[PDB]
Design a protein around this ligand. Structure first.
Ligand SMILES: *CC(=O)N1CCC(C(=O)Nc2ccccc2O)CC1
Ligand SMILES: *CC(=O)N1CCC(C(=O)Nc2ccccc2O)CC1
Lengths: 304, 304
């Protein structure tokens, strides 16, 4: 029993982190096979970041300007290319610790682990969600760029995020491993404001299921609702609209607990309207929305 | 910027987890050098756990009854001994992945990472604190016993916890790696109730400092207090008494933010008396007490 915000074990990703230096900028790279992936802004001076022309900046860079270090050992760069907002540094050595891996572009509401790194060295691991506004709420200081987000399916690491940017509001923006930003964000030091950080309704419901499974049941009530009625209340509280697809996804947790999805919607409606009244659910005083249905089933069944 | 509940990277500990089977019980063991550490209750049947005599139960067990498997490969057990509530299984092979390590007994209020495992296989990593009542609030299903808690100091893993027990209230009890339970708990299926789960005041203050560092400042006020005045309020709210030792420990965060510890005590006093009024601090609606001062400095400075 018990229910924790739980990251994937980071060992397989730790084996992939290197240091990338270009001129005076040091950040992190991901070494898979004979390719090191890193943010293209590694080539920018402070001054460049106001209005960088990356193709023009890159012309001034040769292979030997990209210093790649795995631990204490230097890697030889034998090629470099820009794909969208990432650089792919070809090295002469395949990472011997390369796990089975995929590059995947996640949807808003999907969760992943981040291995925060500095100078190619892991500092910590935490669980994130791709927010509906395509930011993530991370922990990233200077030197943390190139840190990646991932899921593990048994032995296959699905890499979904590389860290690039902090917005003035202290939230985070980055790319998939093809170098495409999540959302409308750019690798430019410019006016970029995040949109409405809406709550991921299906994740809140999943987490209410996890609560019931783990003995926290005080918020169950005598009510039901409909998708349309619930969604009127979701709208008012900046919650994502709940779809039949979300209802279908919650089916296994419904079946396990014997609580109809719409009855749990009715619980959530009352929590939104009435607040927590100073009570907690799984040790939280707000409605947690960074557990997916799959996360709840995973943690509640003990998948490895 | 940003501040997350962050576990240590788990790679070094992943390399140490094995499966231990005795009769029909499967749980986890920690393989360091040529010793596998596991909970002695691996030898109990369900029936035994009501009033086990471990010395007597152990007489019926030989080396060949302890099945130890690292991945797909079996380890040969060449000796076994009971130390307090752990078994030490001597194996004929030193774990080649043994990191630098220490066994340390932590104090209440100290934090650590847990690598939740099932059948010797890592499922996830999360951050815990040794509660003032010597429980931890974990996530542990059947098969998770022998999962360990640890801190990392650069390259040296300090192992502080092995998981043994869930109390009827869904909280967790375990041992250090010398097999001594934290608190008054025993490896018996009996009436064991946790005492008052008091809030770790020095950790709350550390986390308020982390909030200010990261831009969350709405709770700073015009007030100060004294240790004695603050402690009257702490008593009423089941907070640990704040000592001059706690004040001294918070000195670096005081210096960095320019906020006197006692002024931050005054902030915390108002939060305790007035509540959050529906506001959040670092995305929480309650006062977080599972970040130590050292954790805040670590995360806010980017140590690896
Ligand atoms: C995220 C990361 O690790 N980065 C991106 C920022 C640079 C950096 O120092 N850039 C910078 C330029 C001009 C003003 C401020 C500022 O942080 C380091 C690597
Ligand atoms: C923590 C862990 O992984 N354990 C401890 C419990 C046993 C187990 O199955 N014991 C048990 C006996 C009788 C009734 C219930 C119950 O869980 C598995 C390993």
């Amino acid at each position: 029993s018990g229910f924790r915000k739980m990251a994937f074990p980071s060992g397989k990703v730790e084996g992939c982190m290197v240091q990338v230096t270009c001129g005076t900028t040091t950040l992190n790279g991901l070494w898979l096979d004979d390719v090191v992936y890193c943010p293209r802004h590694v080539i920018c001076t402070s001054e460049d970041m106001l209005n960088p022309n990356y193709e023009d900046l890159l012309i001034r860079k040769s292979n030997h300007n990209f210093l790649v270090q795995a631990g204490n050992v230097q890697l030889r760069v034998i090629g470099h290319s820009m794909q969208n907002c990432v650089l792919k540094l070809k090295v002469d050595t395949a990472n011997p610790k390369t796990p089975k891996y995929k590059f995947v572009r996640i949807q808003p509401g999907q969760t992943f682990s981040v291995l925060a790194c500095y100078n190619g060295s892991p500092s910590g691991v935490y669980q994130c969600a791709m927010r509906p506004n395509f930011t993530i709420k991370g922990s990233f200081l200077n030197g943390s760029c190139g840190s990646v987000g991932f899921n593990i399916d048994y032995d296959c690491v699905s890499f979904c995020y590389m860290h690039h940017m902090e917005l003035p509001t202290g939230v985070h923006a980055g790319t998939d491993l093809e170098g495409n930003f999540y959302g409308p964000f750019v690798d430019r030091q410019t006016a970029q404001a995040a949109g409405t950080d809406t709550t991921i309704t299906v994740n809140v419901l999943a987490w209410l299921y996890a609560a019931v499974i783990n003995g926290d049941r005080w918020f169950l009530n005598r009510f039901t609702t409909t998708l349309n009625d619930f969604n009127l209340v979701a709208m008012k509280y900046n919650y994502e609209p709940l779809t039949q697809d979300h209802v279908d996804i919650l089916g296994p947790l419904s079946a396990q607990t014997g609580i109809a999805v719409l009855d749990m919607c009715a619980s959530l409606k009352e929590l939104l309207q009435n607040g927590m009244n100073g009570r907690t659910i799984l040790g939280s005083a707000l409605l947690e929305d960074e557990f997916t249905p799959f996360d709840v089933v995973r943690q509640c069944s003990g998948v490895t």
